[PDB]
Amino acid sequence: RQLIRQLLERDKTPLAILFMAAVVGTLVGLAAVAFDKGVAWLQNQRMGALVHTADNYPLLLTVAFLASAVLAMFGYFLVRKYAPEAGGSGIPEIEGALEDQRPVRWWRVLPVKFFGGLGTLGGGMVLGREGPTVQIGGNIGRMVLDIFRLKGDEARHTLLATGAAAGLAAAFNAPLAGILFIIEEMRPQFRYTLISIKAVFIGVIMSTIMYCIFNHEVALIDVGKLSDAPCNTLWLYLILGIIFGIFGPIFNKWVLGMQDLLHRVHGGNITKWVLMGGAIGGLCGLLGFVAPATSGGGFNLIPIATAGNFSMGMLVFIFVARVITTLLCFSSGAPGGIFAPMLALGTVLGTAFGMVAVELFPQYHLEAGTFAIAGMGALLAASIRAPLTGIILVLEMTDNYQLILPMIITGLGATLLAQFTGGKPLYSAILARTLAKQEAEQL
Amino acid sequence: RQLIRQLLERDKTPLAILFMAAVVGTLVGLAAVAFDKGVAWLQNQRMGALVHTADNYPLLLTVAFLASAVLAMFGYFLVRKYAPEAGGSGIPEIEGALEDQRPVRWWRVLPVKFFGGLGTLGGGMVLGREGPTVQIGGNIGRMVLDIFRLKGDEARHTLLATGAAAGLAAAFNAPLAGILFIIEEMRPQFRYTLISIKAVFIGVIMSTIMYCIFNHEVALIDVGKLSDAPCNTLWLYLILGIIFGIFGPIFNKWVLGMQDLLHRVHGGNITKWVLMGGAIGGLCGLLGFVAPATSGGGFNLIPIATAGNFSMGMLVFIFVARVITTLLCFSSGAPGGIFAPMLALGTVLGTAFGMVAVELFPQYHLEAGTFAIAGMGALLAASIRAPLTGIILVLEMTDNYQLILPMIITGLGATLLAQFTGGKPLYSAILARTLAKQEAEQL
Ligand SMILES: [Cl-]
Ligand SMILES: [Cl-]
Ligand SMILES: [Cl-]
Ligand SMILES: [Cl-]
Numbered sequence: 094r095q096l097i098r099q100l101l102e103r104d105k106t107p108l109a110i111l112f113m114a115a116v117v118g119t120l121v122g123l124a125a126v127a128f129d130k131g132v133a134w135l136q137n138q139r140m141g142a143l144v145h146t147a148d149n150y151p152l153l154l155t156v157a158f159l160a161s162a163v164l165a166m167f168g169y170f171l172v173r174k175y176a177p178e179a180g181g182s183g184i185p186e187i188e189g190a191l192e193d194q195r196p197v198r199w200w201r202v203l204p205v206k207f208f209g210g211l212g213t214l215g216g217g218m219v220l221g222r223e224g225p226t227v228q229i230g231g232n233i234g235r236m237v238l239d240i241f242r243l244k245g246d247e248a249r250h251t252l253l254a255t256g257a258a259a260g261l262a263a264a265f266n267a268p269l270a271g272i273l274f275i276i277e278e279m280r281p282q283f284r285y286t287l288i289s290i291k292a293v294f295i296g297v298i299m300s301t302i303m304y305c306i307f308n309h310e311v312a313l314i315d316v317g318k319l320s321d322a323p324c325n326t327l328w329l330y331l332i333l334g335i336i337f338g339i340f341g342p343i344f345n346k347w348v349l350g351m352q353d354l355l356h357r358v359h360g361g362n363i364t365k366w367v368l369m370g371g372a373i374g375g376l377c378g379l380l381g382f383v384a385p386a387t388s389g390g391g392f393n394l395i396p397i398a399t400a401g402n403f404s405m406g407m408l409v410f411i412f413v414a415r416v417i418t419t420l421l422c423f424s425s426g427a428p429g430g431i432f433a434p435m436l437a438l439g440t441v442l443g444t445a446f447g448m449v450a451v452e453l454f455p456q457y458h459l460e461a462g463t464f465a466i467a468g469m470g471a472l473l474a475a476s477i478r479a480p481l482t483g484i485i486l487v488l489e490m491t492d493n494y495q496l497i498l499p500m501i502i503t504g505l506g507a508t509l510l511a512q513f514t515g516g517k518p519l520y521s522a523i524l525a526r527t528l529a530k531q532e533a534e535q536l
Numbered sequence: 537r538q539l540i541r542q543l544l545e546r547d548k549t550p551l552a553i554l555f556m557a558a559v560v561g562t563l564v565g566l567a568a569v570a571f572d573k574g575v576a577w578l579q580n581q582r583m584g585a586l587v588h589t590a591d592n593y594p595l596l597l598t599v600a601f602l603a604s605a606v607l608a609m610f611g612y613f614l615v616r617k618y619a620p621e622a623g624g625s626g627i628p629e630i631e632g633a634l635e636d637q638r639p640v641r642w643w644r645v646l647p648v649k650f651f652g653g654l655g656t657l658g659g660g661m662v663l664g665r666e667g668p669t670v671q672i673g674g675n676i677g678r679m680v681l682d683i684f685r686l687k688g689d690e691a692r693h694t695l696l697a698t699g700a701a702a703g704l705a706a707a708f709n710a711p712l713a714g715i716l717f718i719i720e721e722m723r724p725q726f727r728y729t730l731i732s733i734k735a736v737f738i739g740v741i742m743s744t745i746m747y748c749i750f751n752h753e754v755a756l757i758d759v760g761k762l763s764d765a766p767c768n769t770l771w772l773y774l775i776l777g778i779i780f781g782i783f784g785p786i787f788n789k790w791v792l793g794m795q796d797l798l799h800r801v802h803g804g805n806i807t808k809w810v811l812m813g814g815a816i817g818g819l820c821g822l823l824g825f826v827a828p829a830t831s832g833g834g835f836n837l838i839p840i841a842t843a844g845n846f847s848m849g850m851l852v853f854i855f856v857a858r859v860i861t862t863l864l865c866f867s868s869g870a871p872g873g874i875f876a877p878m879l880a881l882g883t884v885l886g887t888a889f890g891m892v893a894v895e896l897f898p899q900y901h902l903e904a905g906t907f908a909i910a911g912m913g914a915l916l917a918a919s920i921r922a923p924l925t926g927i928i929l930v931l932e933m934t935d936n937y938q939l940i941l942p943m944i945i946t947g948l949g950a951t952l953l954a955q956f957t958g959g960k961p962l963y964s965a966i967l968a969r970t971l972a973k974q975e976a977e978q979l
Contacts, residue, residue, distance in 0.1 A: 100956070104956075111952070268940055268941055268944050269940060272924065272944075273924075276719065276720065276924075277719055285723060288955075291948065291951060291952055291955070294923075294944060294947075294948045294951075297944065298941070298944055298945055298948060301941050302767065302770060302941070305767040305770075323748075324745050324748040324749060480737070481715065481719075484712075485712070488937075489940075492937070492938075494931075494935075494937045495935075497711060497712055497932065498711050498741065498744055498745075498748075501711055501737065501740070501741055502741055504737075505734065505737040505738065505741065508734055508737070509554070509734055512730070512734075513547070
């Protein structure tokens with residue numbers, strides 16, 4: 094009573110950050126659930142109010158095109174106006190914010206990364222919510238430093254990585270992917286002052302506690318308990334990392350090559366960025382009815398492809414027609430991450446390797462889905478090149494933790510073959526292309 | 537050839553590190569499995585061989601004492617004559633060799649940490665095999681570097697860290713927690729240069745492949761499937777961390793306090809040390825027969841305490857007489873770590889907390905054992921102050937990965953009150969006491 098509580102005056106500012114890291118993690122966990130439950134409302138009101146008479150296929154294709162384009166145009170007009178920095182994932186806009194390179198305007202991003210991400214991702218576009226939640230989370234961590242008035246220089250990098258950790262923890266119910274997002278992915282940007290790593294923990298805890306009360310689901314991806322991977326067959330997860338580790342730098346040259354190729358029909362205009370974003374967001378709404386595996390930001394193709402429900406000629410067709418629809422969305426300037434459309438390209442090429450590995454090897458008794466869970470985090474290690482948070486996020490979402498060894502081998506063969514090929518991390522190459530564009534345009 | 541020529545000009549010395557880290561990682565899967573199969577064959581040769589108790593009880597308590605003390609005076613003697621750095625855990629001898637301070641004498645530690653870790657830890661003493669596998673692993677990472685005569689200090693800090701991560705991946709069968717030993721626990725010593733981390737990833741998976749070849753994996757601790765905790769009850773995991781976070785600085789105050797206190801009964805001699813080691817390590821083979829939860833490394837009673845086969849008049853006798861046999865065994869110069877004795881120390885105080893919360897709160901319908909898994913990584917976060925190497929290492933040996941939010945909450949409140957109530961990490965306070973005692977030797 095009177096022998097313990099007098100030590101608060103000794104370290105009053107560390108206990109001022111760790112209390113504020115509890116209100117960062119609470120406010121990010123509310124803004125992430127209202128994102129995910131608010132984007133599922135616009136996705137259920139779209140397909141639910143699509144079929145009306147069930148025999149009017151000319152009008153039903155028109156409604157599926159316009160009602161997903163106007164929602165997408167609401168997410169493209171609110172981005173190039175009033176908040177131009179919320180025009181992509183948001184992981185490069187916080188990686189250049191832990192180091193003092195990019196400004197953090199929470200008064201502009203938070204009514205835009207929320208209300209534009211609800212119209213972009215709610216239009217059936219191939220874009221995930223790992224983008225608009227870590228960017229929202231990185232700005233709520235900046236928001237409480239202007240509400241609670243503190244001008245600390247170490248309390249502004251601590252809370253901005255707290256809500257960024259709380260954004261990944263409250264988007265995928267993944268408390269371990271949120272902490273290791275700051276540790277090993279954002280390694281040259283984090284400080285680790287022994288109180289900042291405790292403040293990341295409170296923000297991750299309070300954002301996953303607020304995921305309990307409104308999301309009573311067991312997993313985000315509903316693939317059950319798959320088979321084990323014996324260590325007679327752990328060399329096929331090294332050939333899987335070789336195949337994924339070569340496509341990774343080729344995909345990063347395709348992301349950054351389509352950001353400049355699509356930036357030629359409009360050239361930077363406002364009346365032509367929006368009309369192009371409605372032609373993209375309407376095409377991914379028109380694809381939501383005629384081919385539901387092509388459109389969408391993953392997470393429904395993922396527990397279907399890993400069960401062997403697709404054929405071989407249809408898994409090749411999806412990988413061609415999902416690369417086209419994920420380079421037309423993320424490499425266009427829409428608020429939405431490339432993360433969840435990379436989880437849907439990992440279970441397609443992973444199963445296409447897993448369906449061939451049971452024809453050449455009948456003596457291994459291989460399941461065709463164990464290469465889809467392992468391949469899911471193998472494009473996150475070759476493109477983004479954050480292999481450890483990309484294999485404690487496939488495990489946190491599919492709950493298939495028995496593949497903890499084969500998912501490292503395909504996460505290590507992907508990182509090793511992406512560095513040998515000549516590939517950069519994707520979230521550090523979008524940031525390095527926006528800083529060099531900022532320096533060369535104002536001069 | 538074409539590709540063969542261009543892989544030798546630019547990246548040859550980075551590829552020589554990634555090939556050495558596969559030879560380093562393989563050799564801590566053959567010297568780490570045969571260490572665990574040597575302490576388990578010696579365990580079933582002194583307590584499984586002398587099993588007939590129906591004939592002579594006074595002629596068996598001496599055999600349970602003499603056969604476990606003669607093994608104890610082989611390791612208390614090999615350390616004190618041939619490799620004095622091999623005594624104790626061995627993580628502070630790698631934590632203090634990763635930067636510049638202590639040498640890595642693989643020509644002295646490896647015949648002593650092996651055949652003394654077989655003698656003490658396999659001869660019935662309360663010691664964990666994490667310690668004698670990090671130091672054997674880190675010395676192998678220097679041994680292969682010295683045999684192949686690699687040139688540079690960039691590979692010396694690299695390959696010593698791959699072997700210390702190869703040790704944790706095969707002593708406990710955890711590929712994911714071995715990398716977080718180097719990333720999270722070895723934070724201010726390890727150098728991250730984008731090739732050394734892939735040498736750790738190579739050295740870990742080459743040390744877990746060589747586990748399942750010999751030791752066919754299912755789980756170390758055989759708790760089957762505990763109940764998924766309803767996260768209404770997550771505030772009880774914070775008071776579990778508060779209770780452990782107070783005891784944590786009190787516990788390692790006894791660890792360093794008993795190393796100094798036991799240093800007066802023998803002085804610094806080599807006859808009085810093994811005669812102390814023949815009684816302080818000798819009664820734990822006698823306590824391993826009349827009360828087998830009071831002695832031993834502390835892994836047999838973890839499935840017994842978590843399942844709830846104890847009362848709270850026996851859950852105190854295996855905590856009062858379990859801290860005594862842990863401070864006597866580890867903190868007296870015996871070649872054996874303290875991870876597994878403070879793992880059995882967390883699941884006993886966690887079950888005592890678990891058996892109380894099911895009486896005061898019948899509305900929650902709690903299990904008394906879900907706090908035992910959450911309390912296992914609590915003393916590893918309060919004393920060692922490495923939560924993510926404690927709350928991920930016990931998920932991989934118990935195979936209950938649904939308690940992550942109950943364990944990050946317990947791992948936070950353990951770390952938060954071990955910093956407030958001033959407690960340094962155990963392996964950073966053991967090393968800083970051996971650094972100050974070697975600077976007083978030169979004068
Ligand atoms: Cl972008
Ligand atoms: Cl989505
Ligand atoms: Cl020691
Ligand atoms: Cl042990």
